[PDB]
Amino acid sequence: ELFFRSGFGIGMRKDSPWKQNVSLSILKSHENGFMEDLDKTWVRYQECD
Amino acid sequence: QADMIVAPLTINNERAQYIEFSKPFKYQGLTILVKKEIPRSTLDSFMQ
Amino acid sequence: FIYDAAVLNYMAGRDEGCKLVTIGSGKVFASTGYGIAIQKDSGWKRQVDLAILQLFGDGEMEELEALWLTGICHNEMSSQLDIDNMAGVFYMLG
Amino acid sequence: GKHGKKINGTWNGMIGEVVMKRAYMAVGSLTINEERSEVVDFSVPFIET
Numbered sequence: 001e002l003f004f005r006s007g008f009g010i011g012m013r014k015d016s017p018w019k020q021n022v023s024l025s026i027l028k029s030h031e032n033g034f035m036e037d038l039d040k041t042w043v044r045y046q047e048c049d
Numbered sequence: 050q051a052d053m054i055v056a057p058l059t060i061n062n063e064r065a066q067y068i069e070f071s072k073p074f075k076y077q078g079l080t081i082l083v084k085k086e087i088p089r090s091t092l093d094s095f096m097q
Numbered sequence: 098f099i100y101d102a103a104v105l106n107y108m109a110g111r112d113e114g115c116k117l118v119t120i121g122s123g124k125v126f127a128s129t130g131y132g133i134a135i136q137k138d139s140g141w142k143r144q145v146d147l148a149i150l151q152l153f154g155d156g157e158m159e160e161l162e163a164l165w166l167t168g169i170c171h172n173e174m175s176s177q178l179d180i181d182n183m184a185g186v187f188y189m190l191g
Numbered sequence: 192g193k194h195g196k197k198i199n200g201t202w203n204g205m206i207g208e209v210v211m212k213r214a215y216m217a218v219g220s221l222t223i224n225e226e227r228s229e230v231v232d233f234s235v236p237f238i239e240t
């Protein structure tokens with residue numbers, strides 16, 4: 001089983017004027033189902049099981 | 050040289066001191082993989 | 098039922114004989130975490146984030162959850178036939 | 192109220208105390224989303240949901 005839980009994330013330098021908008025767009029994509037299309041298309045391609 | 054690290058990058062205490070990390074793509078963890086052994090075990094046939 | 102994922106998992110892996118099971122063996126649909134709301138612009142945000150991040154690299158909540166969020170069952174005779182699959186044998190004779 | 196809802200442009204619950212400047216901090220079982228993230232500044236998540 002997993003033993004160190006920590007997500008990925010877009011990174012940038014401090015005081016960059018985009019530290020407020022880009023985080024909100026990531027959250028807004030989670031609810032609107034965009035991450036469902038991307039995860040299914042690339043990761044979950046399915047094969048022998 | 051650049052401004053955004055658009056790449057798989059985990060976040061921890063050391064890096065967060067110098068750069069803020071916005072919000073996570075997705076949540077994952079650390080595991081271990083090992084090669085499968087003997088796809089056809091008990092190969093010993095009849096006449097045994 | 099439709100509710101928070103973390104709460105529903107605790108109920109499901111707790112009942113008698115773990116009969117109650119989530120659909121598709123635990124599939125989530127909007128991965129949004131928890132958090133600690135603070136006043137806008139409040140200066141406590143910067144250093145409180147580091148403290149939480151530090152504990153993740155020290156294995157604190159990894160074992161802390163075992164003290165409160167541990168299930169009872171594992172999400173895995175009857176010598177009877179009662180047709181079962183023997184219909185195919187009769188289906189052959191069909 | 193419980194967990195906060197926006198009615199007539201007002202917030203109640205724990206998210207209603209912080210917006211009205213009576214709490215300065217709220218903890219418990221709070222779910223991050225765009226609408227709540229505009230008023231308060233959520234910290235780094237520590238539990239999947």
Ligand SMILES: *[C@@H]1O[C@H](CO)[C@@H](O)[C@H](O)[C@H]1NC(C)=O
Pocket residue numbers: 017018020021
């Ligand atoms: C952040 O988003 C709002 C939404 O309209 C926009 O008005 C504002 O200009 C954005 N700020 C930056 C720095 O892009």
